[PDB]
């Protein structure tokens, strides 16, 4: 039926990177215990909230499929509980820090000791041996140490941080692999195994595509496909020509097209008003013909100047300009469809109130709406993943030690015994 | 031990979403059959290549740990040896655009008859039941209509694309975890499931915070920790204040915190010169006071509308516009560590060439020196979960065809057989 069904996991994380992947688990069918902070609880429940005291949507959203239980681990008996629990767990999921859960004496020696079945995986800024093997890190700063803030943006600009977030829920998604990786694994060995997976490096393999072109700008001198190749067309704040003569690192190409063939972000009717009014047009090297149908430039199929990659390369921001000009009395979806009567790979910008309430989305399971009957129903990004023979069942977030005594009940304990632990507060 | 070892995939992908896919499952051990189009075979092999007449690094970066087999799969014994292949693999992977594998006779329900147990996984664009289940899909289109595009970038410039691969890799990563799901469900069921993710979906995971934000502007109309909301900060085309009025979808922020405490992309030394001459400052609440102790400024800590989150959200950029102003003379890790004793979230910018040559990411295997002895050597990324009991072992891009001889061997075919493939052009 689900995948992960009958996983029982330990989630000590908080934030966004391991709880992203901690509700995906539980999304696939795993069995979540958020373990959270007596009293505080995972930092996000108060983060941004739309309302007073009511858990905000950044921990909403992060959380579903989810049980809660607080628990005070500088205690003693805090530690304990865990034994209790780790040896009824298949996976440990945890960020705090680079040695925050060893400090707390659980190590991973100790662990398998406890539990040789046990996964513990974890989510580290730098990877282990790294010079910054210590540094606490969040979104943005990943993004830098992994080579996308860098290679995102505009020449003339600074490096930019991307909206999609490259170091948390990537980090998180990444973990998942390992995790998984690792259940794998465990059935041929019957051994539980640590996995880890670090910001930067989660970031770096995104960046993939970049590493190549820094291996052919060292190689070549030049990247065809960037802006900077065409002569005089790209300047910095002062006015200064930029070319690939004295570009030593991959530079900001702006909307140019990364991994796919090259592309621009194109105006299109109302780009003044609305932020969102424009699409990305593809310029295929298999496709120049059918370009050239388009926008009525027939003189353009036989030129030699135009009809190759190699041709363009001069001129091609020069196309894109004139290109976006046809498009000035349409908007997004008007040029989409336009350019799919020719086949040629083009989409709108979608804005996230046009994503929110799309319809096709929340057909698919992509958009959903999340029944929450104690905060009010709020809309989730499901399951990325779709399969023939699963669907995934998604339920709000756990208020705070919602399902304390809940658990502690499951692991044996009785009404008296965990009534002293409400009262010693270790719970 | 090998997390995929004995794992058969019979990899159909080109480009680089289903690509980065199984390469990164043949680092996990997977033994990866990549069949190619005859006399071309994947498109990445002749795409930006930095010499002539050899692969490029598109290709080799996106293809290690994979053999290679030709096959004219519109051939009437092209796809006896589909069938014959499938019946031998535990998951096929494939990334033709909307039909293609249909329209070639292998739809799901025919693949379920040639082998119960074999998973089907794909990528495309959109999600299967969406209004553009049939368009094809690059890169960067698929960051446009996931929303990451429409998030990314400043509000006085158009949707910005990131640098990283939202699209491609990133899909091919989900793709990746709903492989190894639908493994752990076969462990159970003993068959066989259809798995795919659209690179749209995969996108909308990542950019889960900005549906969080657009529901947040929905609920409250305004979002206090984007530049929009400080009193007249951020300007529009003409020279007039920006603010939540009259916004009703989530906004490109520049260099906000997004998925974190707020922050800003600030000048270094050399920042005319150097374009990754920046560091990213964040400004948490924890820690306010120690960022008072750098900035050599105690009048904050004391001043309750600078020591809160709520007592700033007006003078944000203020501050940030300040800060820089110190890390005028010096450098990307001058300001990194000149902070980092305050245990304060600062990061540089890291570039592609730094981290391209950085002996740190070496050493933890994350970019790795590939030995190929027909091509050169190259760097490339390796696997960015670390296993305490598992390395992997990266090997070099096969050349189109290399194996298909060996592959046909495998199967039963004899000596003769195949000098007959290859003369009636199927192979
Ligand atoms: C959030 C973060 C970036 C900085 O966090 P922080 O505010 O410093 O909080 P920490 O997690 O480091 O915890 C501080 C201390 O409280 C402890 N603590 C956490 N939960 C606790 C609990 N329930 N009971 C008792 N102590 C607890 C930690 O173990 C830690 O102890 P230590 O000082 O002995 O190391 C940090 O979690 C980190 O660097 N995480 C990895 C980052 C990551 O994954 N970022 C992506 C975020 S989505
Ligand atoms: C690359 C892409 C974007 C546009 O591709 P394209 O140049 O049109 O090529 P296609 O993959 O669609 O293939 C064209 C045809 O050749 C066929 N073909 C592919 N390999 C073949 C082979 N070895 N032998 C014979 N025919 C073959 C395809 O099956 C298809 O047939 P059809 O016209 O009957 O549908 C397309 O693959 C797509 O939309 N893919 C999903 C996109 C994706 O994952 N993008 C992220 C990129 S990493």
Request: charged share 25%.
């Amino acid at each position: 039926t689900k995948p992960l069904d009958g996983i029982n996991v330990l989630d000590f994380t908080h934030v966004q990177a391991g709880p992203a992947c901690t509700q995906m688990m539980g999304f696939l069918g795993a069995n979540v215990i958020k373990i959270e902070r007596r009293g505080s609880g995972d930092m996000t429940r108060g983060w941004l909230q739309d309302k007073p005291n009511v858990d905000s949507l950044y921990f909403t959203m992060f959380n579903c499929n989810k049980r809660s239980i607080e628990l005070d681990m500088k205690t003693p008996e805090g530690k304990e509980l865990l034994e209790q629990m780790i040896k009824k767990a298949d996976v440990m999921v945890e960020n705090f820090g680079p040695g925050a859960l060893d400090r707390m004496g659980f190590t991973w020696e100790y662990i398998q000791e406890l539990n040789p079945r046990v996964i513990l995986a974890s989510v580290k800024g730098y990877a282990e041996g790294h010079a910054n093997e210590h540094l606490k890190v969040y979104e943005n700063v990943a993004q830098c140490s992994g080579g996308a803030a860098a290679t995102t943006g505009f020449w003339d600009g600074p490096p930019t941080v991307s909206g999609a977030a490259l170091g948390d829920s990537n980090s998180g998604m990444h973990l998942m692999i390992g995790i998984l990786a690792a259940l794998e694994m465990r059935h041929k060995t019957g051994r539980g195994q640590k996995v880890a997976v670090a910001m930067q490096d989660a970031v770096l393999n995104l960046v993939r595509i970049k590493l190549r072109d820094q291996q052919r700008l060292e190689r070549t001198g030049i990247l065809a496909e960037y802006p900077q190749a065409q002569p005089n067309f790209a300047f910095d704040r002062d006015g200064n020509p930029l070319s690939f003569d004295n570009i030593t690192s991959v530079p900001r190409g702006g909307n140019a097209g990364g991994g796919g063939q090259p592309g621009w972000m194109l105006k299109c009717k109302g780009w003044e008003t609305d932020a969102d009014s424009y699409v990305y047009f593809t310029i295929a090297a298999n496709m120049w013909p059918q370009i050239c149908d388009m926008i009525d430039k027939p003189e353009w199929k036989d030129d030699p100047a135009y009809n190759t990659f190699e041709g363009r390369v001069d001129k091609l921001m020069d196309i894109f300009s004139f290109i976006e000009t046809k498009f000035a009395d349409k908007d997004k979806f008007e040029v989409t469809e336009w350019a799919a009567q020719y086949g040629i790979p083009c989409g709108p910008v979608m804005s996230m109130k046009e994503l929110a309430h799309d319809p096709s989305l929340q057909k698919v399971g992509t958009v959903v709406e999340v029944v929450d009957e104690i905060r009010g129903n709020h809309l989730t990004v499901g399951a990325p993943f779709k399969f023939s023979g699963f669907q995934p069942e998604i339920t709000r977030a756990p208020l705070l030690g919602e399902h304390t005594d809940e658990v502690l009940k499951e692991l044996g304990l009785d009404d008296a015994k965990i009534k002293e632990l409400h009262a010693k507060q270790v719970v």
